[PDB]
Every structure is written in C-alpha cells, then in structure tokens.
C-alpha cells in the first residue's frame, strides 16, 4: 500500500475517515491547527471503494483528544486496523468499524496529538501518532 | 487547565518593550 | 539538522 | 506598528527582509519548512519605502541558523531593531543595518529556530523567536 | 507555571 | 493501592520488578540517568510477598526502551497490570507475568521513555509514563 | 537516537 | 578554569551566587525543583575568595525567572560575566556585580530555564541556561 506521515502541527480540529462494518478503516484525513488556523491534510484513500465517510468535527482549542483505541485483526489475509474509537474531554466518537480482533488503546495523560502516519492499500494497515506539549 | 493548543518555547522580544 | 522532531508512538497494526 | 505571529514551523528555508543603513530593519518574510514542504510566509512590510532587499537561502535541512544577534535603538524616536545578523552552521548573512546602539545576543546551543513574531511599522518594532528541538 | 510539564501516557491497569 | 509517581528524568538505568505467575505485577523501582548520574528511585513495594525477582540492567545510553507491553486483568476480584514486556533496540525482556487479559501496548518510534507513576496495593493496579525527547 | 533525553539549550554569553 | 553542566531539571527554587564589586560573578549554585522536590546543584566555586554571597529564593512555584541580563567585560586579562540580573514575574533581583561592559539579555516569552551549565575560574567566563516548557 502507499505510506503516508502528514507530520506534526499544533493539533487537531476534525477527523474524516471512512470504513466498513465486514472489513476495516478505509480513508483517514486530518483537518489539523497550525498556529491558530486551519490546515487541510492530505486525504489518504484506499485502492478501492464503497466505504462510508464519516466526519469528527472538534470544538477546538477547548475540545481535544485524550484517548484513541481500536482493533487490529485479519481481512482477506493482511492484518490491518479494523476500527478506531476516539474519545476527548467532552466526547466518544465510535467505534468505526468491525469491534473484533486484537484491542489497542493509547490514553493520553498529558500532552497533545498533532500528526499522524502510516499506511493505507485497501484498508488502513497501520498508523503512528506525534505527540506534543 | 490543558488546551488544545501545543506549545512551543518562546525567547524575546528585543526591540520596543 | 534543521528539521525540528517530535515524539512518535506507533506503530499499531501489521 | 502591524503585529504579526507567523507561528511554529519545522524549520527555516530562506529569510526576505529588507534594512536600511542609516535607520533600522524594515520588511521581514519567512519561507519555513512545514514537514517536508517549503512554507511560504506572509510577508511582513514596513509602512514606508527606501529599503534594501536581502535574500538568505539557507541548504536546507544541513544548514540552520545558530545565533542571531542584532542592534536596538532610536529611531525618529521609536525604539526600533536596528540590526541584524544571522549566523548558521555555515556561514555568517550579515550584519544588515546600522551597528549601533544596545547590542543583543541569541546563541542556541542545542535546539532551533522554529518560527518568527513581531510588530512592524516604519520599521521592526520588535521581535521574537519560536525554539524548538 | 514554574514547572516544567511532560508528555505522559496512560495509565494502562484500573479506574 | 498506594499511588506513587517518581516524576521525570534524563534517562533510564536498570528497572527491578516482581512478579508471580499465579497473579500479577508485584515491585516496581527504577534506576534513572539524573544528567548522568544513576538516581536510585524509591522501591515501589506490593503490599505481600513471594514473588520472583527481575533484574533489567540496560547498557545505557547505548540500549533503551523502545516499546512497553503487557496484560491487564482480574486477580482476586482486581483489575490490575498482570504481565509486562520491554523490548530496546538491543533486547526483549519478558513477558514477566502470565499473559491473559487485555492487551496493550506502547510502541516508542522517536523519543525516550523517562518516568513512571502508578499505584500498588497486592499488586500493581495501574502505570502511566512520562514520554520526552 | 540516543537513550539520552535532550532540551533546548541557549547561550554562552561572557565570551564564546 | 572549571567547566560544569547541572544539566535540566523540573523548575528553579533558589539561586546563591557571590560577587565583588572590584570585579565580576564568582560562585553559582543552584537549588532546582526535581518533580516536586528541592534537589541542591553542585557548587561551582569561584578559585579565589574574598566574594559577597548572595540568595535568591524564590517562592516556587507561583514566582520564576522571565528575564536574565547583565555585563560581559575585561577584569585583568579575562572577559568574563561582571553582573547578573533575574527578574522574575514577581520582582527583580540585582544587578549584582559591576554593571560595566556589553550588555546581554534573555527575555523569555514562554517556557522555563530549567538548568545552567558554564565554566568558573576566578570568576564566572560564560554560562548556558537550558529552556523547556
Ligand atoms: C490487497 O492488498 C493491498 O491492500 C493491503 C491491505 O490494505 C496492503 O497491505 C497491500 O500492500 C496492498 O496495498
Ligand atoms: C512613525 O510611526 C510608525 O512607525 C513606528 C516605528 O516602526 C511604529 O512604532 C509606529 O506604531 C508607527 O507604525
Ligand atoms: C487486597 O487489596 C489491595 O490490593 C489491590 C490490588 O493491588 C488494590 O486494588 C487494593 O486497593 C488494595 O491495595
Ligand atoms: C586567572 O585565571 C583563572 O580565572 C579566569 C577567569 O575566571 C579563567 O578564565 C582562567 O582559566 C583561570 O581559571
């Protein structure tokens, strides 16, 4: 699959991601805060299509994430990341996705995402994520 | 207190206090 | 280098 | 004068400004580095004309600024930046202006230049420097 | 503050 | 349990922890680079006895931790951290612990791991750690 | 990278 | 004559430092906080003796230093640091020393001085100060 790494910004105002209730993430773009203002990240797709977008607008600066967990597992034979939940100070959006397989979680005691990497072919195989004060 | 904001160490201003 | 660096934590998944 | 806030960045790729030798700094410009992606900044113009331009390009990422230092003083009454100098691991742009008055001396060990702030009006008011790893 | 802050992830355990 | 949080520090040493098979996590004490100088952190005592003793002495600054995982889980009706693992760029020490429960775990692509807080009662309850550059 | 934590570090002033 | 690094710390609880006014800073040492705790610095102490010591306590965590500054200039063959000043977000302490020479100043804007390395003769050559939020 293409391998993508958007960076590190000063944080997050939305989430777009698209996936599949009978395989995984599929599309994942950042509406990142460089210095008070909105950027636009790069959209990174799947191969394929039929997914379903789905958006996470955030009230930023007051709304910001604190814990972000999902699920790796099997589909079609690679492993990938088949749903993501997102929790902030003030909300849960998710679970995205198929609730199955290996669980993962980062919770965030002090500190700030600003940047996420990765990889996505069909679906979302793996990500990373920059964190900052 | 935390904000959605990160942070970065700021030095000065030299010039006009 | 001039490139400023970041914590990274990661990867999850294959 | 107009204050301005260009923000944090990844690093520096080439300075614009402009200096007049009998008085102070007058426009100041920044294209950054934004992950990779050269970052044009807005550029920050004095009120007035009669000004000299400079370019700085610096080899990014290899070379980077390590010491900025300067002059402050009056000017038609306003204490203004009189001076500048920036020194990289390469070599020395600089002095731009007039070398005199209160000098000012920013060395940076370890760490680098991430971002400018300021305010300028006939000319660079004052100034400060964004530092990060 | 006059305290310096750090990154901090976690806690992995209860609560 | 009791809560402790040895703060933050340059780098890290040695860590001495305790485990049983039959149960969970029990000691926890770490050894910290103090700007070059081993800090004996304080030891971090389960409230019983009779565990196994496990002694991780990292070839510092050479060798560091680059990822922390483990098993949370219920022992005698508490849900605490049953069996952890780390793996630096040099070796892989552990599972300490059975590994049954839920999974996690915190992979370090950049940056050092340089604290750990937490809580110990029987065993240990839960952890968190300091992240930094 | 180093197991060595680092921070930003300005200066010397009172000659180089 | 001796060169030291105290290295970075949590924060600032008390500077003592000694000067003469025939001459320049002779010895600095520092109180930091270490997570939550004083942890006393290393003495860096002047060769010669006959200096006035003073103490800077600062009520930690409310009170910290936003600005250094002082004098650099020759004292019988050596240019070194003849006075410093710290002025906190509550009050300023000195000058203390001679205040003749080329000035230096260190304002800071956001962050923290953390830490101070340097070298001591007879009297203070130079100094360093670490910054992190
Ligand atoms: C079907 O194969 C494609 O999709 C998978 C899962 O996304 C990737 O791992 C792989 O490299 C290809 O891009
Ligand atoms: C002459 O006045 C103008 O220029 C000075 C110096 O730049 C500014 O301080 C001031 O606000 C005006 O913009
Ligand atoms: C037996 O109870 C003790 O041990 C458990 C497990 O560590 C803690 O949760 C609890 O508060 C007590 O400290
Ligand atoms: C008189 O010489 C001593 O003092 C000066 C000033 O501190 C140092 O530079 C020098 O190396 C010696 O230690």
Same mark, same amino acid.
């Given at each position: ?20 209730? *009978? ?39 007051? *709304?910001?994430?604190? *814990? ?40 965030? *005691? ?24 | ?17």
């Amino acid at each position: 699959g293409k391998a993508f790494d958007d960076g590190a910004f000063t944080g997050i105002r939305e989430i777009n991601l698209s996936y599949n209730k *009978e395989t995984a993430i599929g599309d994942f773009q950042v509406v990142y805060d460089l210095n008070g203002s909105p950027y636009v990240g790069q959209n990174h797709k799947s191969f394929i299509t039929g997914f379903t977008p789905v958006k996470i607008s955030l009230d930023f600066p007051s *709304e910001y994430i604190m *814990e972000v967990s999902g699920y790796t597992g099997n589909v079609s034979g690679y492993v990938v990341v088949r749903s993501l939940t997102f929790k902030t100070n003030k909300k849960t959006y998710g679970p995205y996705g198929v609730t199955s397989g290996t669980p993962f979680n980062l919770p965030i *005691e002090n500190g700030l995402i600003v940047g996420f990497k990765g990889s996505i072919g069909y679906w979302l195989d793996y990500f990373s994520m920059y964190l900052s004060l | 207190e935390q904000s959605g904001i990160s942070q970065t160490v700021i030095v000065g201003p030299w010039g006009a206090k």
